[PDB]
């Protein structure tokens, strides 16, 4: 049971995302069901380690945001084109 | 002495040592293997 | 080395011999050859059968791992190399004697005969453990003390 920690994103866009990336974090989003899509940041290092394991993508994961466990499954992942790095993650509610 | 841009351990015995700001391969076993960076 | 389901086996046999055993000797095999242990094989072989085992275990988590249970005085006989020779069926027999006679032929050493745990001492090569079945020496003076 992978448990990710996350913060809700104040500012969204191109510049903001870049800034986030620079500061060892990276954006991500949750979407699925009736509930509205939730944009979050994630600490990069923690998540990269997690995603090395193939069980990360198959199993259900738990994102903690504002002290609230959302159960999601990793739908898609943007990787950096020539680095071991994550640009962005799409999580789907489960 | 081989003096190369690319100096490498060529065997188990070959050891790399920097002396006076010069990477050098010194090998106890084989004289041919001894190298210098240049 | 394995993990933890293999090292215990050695201690299991160690404790088993340490506890369920008797008089034991020592053989500091600092440079064991091939005939050194081979000569002991025959010596140990004589004693009943294969009960006088003598493995090369001198680790604190090996031969000293089974010291808390029985033979609680091998902490001083645990340094360097100490080949505990725990016995089994019988008692002391000639193990100590044989060991002394086998260690007097320059067979490596034995840490100055450290000794195991039987009486209430430490190092003491005694020869009062040899005869333990003789019962025909009391039938030699009966046909010579009758005429006179």
């Amino acid at each position: 049971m992978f448990t990710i920690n996350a913060e809700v994103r104040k500012e969204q866009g191109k510049g903001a995302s870049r800034r986030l990336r620079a500061a060892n974090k990276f954006p991500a989003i949750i979407y699925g069901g009736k509930e509205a899509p939730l944009a979050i940041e994630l600490d990069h290092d923690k998540v990269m380690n997690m995603q090395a394991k193939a069980e990360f993508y198959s199993e259900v994961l738990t994102i903690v945001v504002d002290g609230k466990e959302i159960k999601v499954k990793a739908q898609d992942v943007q990787r950096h084109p020539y680095k071991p790095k994550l640009q962005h993650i799409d999580f789907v509610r489960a | 002495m081989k003096v190369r841009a690319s100096v490498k351990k060529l065997c188990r015995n070959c050891k790399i040592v920097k002396r006076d700001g010069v990477i050098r391969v010194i090998c106890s076993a084989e004289p041919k293997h001894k190298q210098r960076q240049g | 080395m394995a993990l933890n389901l293999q090292d215990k086996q050695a201690i299991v046999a160690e404790v088993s011999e340490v506890a369920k055993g008797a008089l034991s000797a020592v053989v500091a095999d600092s440079r064991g050859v091939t005939v050194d242990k081979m000569t002991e094989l025959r010596k140990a072989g004589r004693e009943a059968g294969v009960y006088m085992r003598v493995v090369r275990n001198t680790l604190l988590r090996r031969a000293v791992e089974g010291t808390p249970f029985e033979c609680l005085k091998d902490a001083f006989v645990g340094p360097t190399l100490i080949a505990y020779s725990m016995e089994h069926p019988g008692a002391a027999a000639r193990l100590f004697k044989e060991f002394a006679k086998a260690n007097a032929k320059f067979e490596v050493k034995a840490a100055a005969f450290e000794g195991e745990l039987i009486p209430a001492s430490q190092i003491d090569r005694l020869a009062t453990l040899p005869t333990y079945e003789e019962a025909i020496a009391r039938l030699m003076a009966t046909m010579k003390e009758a005429s006179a």
């Binding site: - | - | 005939v35 000569t39 094989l41 059968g49 294969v50």
Partner: protein, 141 residues
């Protein structure tokens, strides 16, 4: 036995200790005597068996007179004169064709129990199985 000196083991003859082509002068010349190999070795050869290879070890140093010692037969050649096929194979080790006996491979190992580390008598027979399966001889146990 605790110390050794020189030793040149070689399958010699017990019937008549006087070879030439096989051994002869090559059995002893570095201080060894070939005249003391047919007056003592034969003495302890007419009280057992003579005819099959008998490896011998001469305890010669530099004091001329030496001390002839005995030995034992090979366990690998014990499945030739006390089993079946003498060769023990015949074709390249790839197709098992050899065999042994379930009633044997136990009393044939008791004869050479003076060179077995196996404390137990049945423990020495366990090593025979591996020596009797060198090529893969399948026994009918």
């Amino acid at each position: 036995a605790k110390k050794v000196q020189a030793y040149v083991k070689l399958q010699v003859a017990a019937g008549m200790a006087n070879p030439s082509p096989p051994v002869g002068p090559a059995l002893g010349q570095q201080g060894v005597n070939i005249m003391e190999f047919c007056k003592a070795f034969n003495a302890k050869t007419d009280s057992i068996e003579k005819g099959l290879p008998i490896p011998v070890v001469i305890t010669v140093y530099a004091d001329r007179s030496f001390t002839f010692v005995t030995k034992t037969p090979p366990a690998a050649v014990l499945l030739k004169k006390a089993a079946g096929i003498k060769s023990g194979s015949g074709k390249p080790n790839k197709d098992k064709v050899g065999k042994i006996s379930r009633a044997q491979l136990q009393e044939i190992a008791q004869t050479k129990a003076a060179d077995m580390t196996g404390a137990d008598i049945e423990a020495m027979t366990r090593s025979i199985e591996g020596t009797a399966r060198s090529m893969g001889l399948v026994v009918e146990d």
